[PDB]
Amino acid sequence: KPINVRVTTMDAELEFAIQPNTTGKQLFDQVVKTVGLREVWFFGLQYVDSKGYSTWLKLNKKVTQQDVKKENPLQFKFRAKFFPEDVSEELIQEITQRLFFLQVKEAILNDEIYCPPETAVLLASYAVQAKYGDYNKEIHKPGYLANDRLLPQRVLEQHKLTKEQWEERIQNWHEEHRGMLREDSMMEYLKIAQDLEMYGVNYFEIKNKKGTELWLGVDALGLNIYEHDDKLTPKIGFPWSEIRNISFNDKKFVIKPIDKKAPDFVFYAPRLRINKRILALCMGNHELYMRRRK
């Protein structure tokens, strides 16, 4: 009474104040009012608890009842928790497109989403077009990208190419985007991004009966299972349309099919905190899958 609050979107900082009574939903609704967002289903608020773990904020609960890291002001991240099946059909608003664009790019650059070198360079050139506008000989002299985080660290490491050489490659691509608007630029970035194998999938360390470490990916299209050393190749898939119920108890997940004659799929996951999030992503992705088909 009153508690200071800071929420960052990918491009802005917002300062608010809340009461001990304030629910997540209200703080969340404030953000979307300030940001002018209409496709709210994709997004959520993100915080650090007293332990130090990143957590999604529960909306139907009070904010001061969720053990947010005690500090002045309280820190939040407005971010996408769910991803569209296709960006062209589902990102109608400008701001929406912008927010997705900046988040995905950050994922690329921080090496959260795997991206090969040639595709990375083409992604960079769109982020350049979006930021610098039309290429211009007089303005964009050799070296104008020296102060830009353009390529992922993986790509810079995996070559014998120098700094300015990568920059020459991006420039060459930039020149060719000579007609493109900022809106179009961000979308082309996203259209290429969305087809990277690691795009829009949450990864979770899981186990089989033998205790073999594996990966479980939750995405828009359903669930996937990966080799522990290959996050790019799905080995077993469960499309949402084939699932009936997902639940967990302690450390064990049960997935029941629609078939009803088919057997339950079982796997294991270590921490309870992660399990809550796994559950939440499943329900949310399943919901949006169905809504797109009603």
């Binding site: 089989n208 190749t233 799905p234 088919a262 057997p263 796997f267």
Partner: peptide, 18 residues
């Protein structure tokens, strides 16, 4: 990239095999 199409018994089988 789309996981190889298969039935549920096969899924449990392969998963246990890893």
């Amino acid at each position: 990239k789309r996981a190889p199409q298969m039935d549920w018994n096969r899924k449990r089988e392969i998963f246990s095999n890893f």
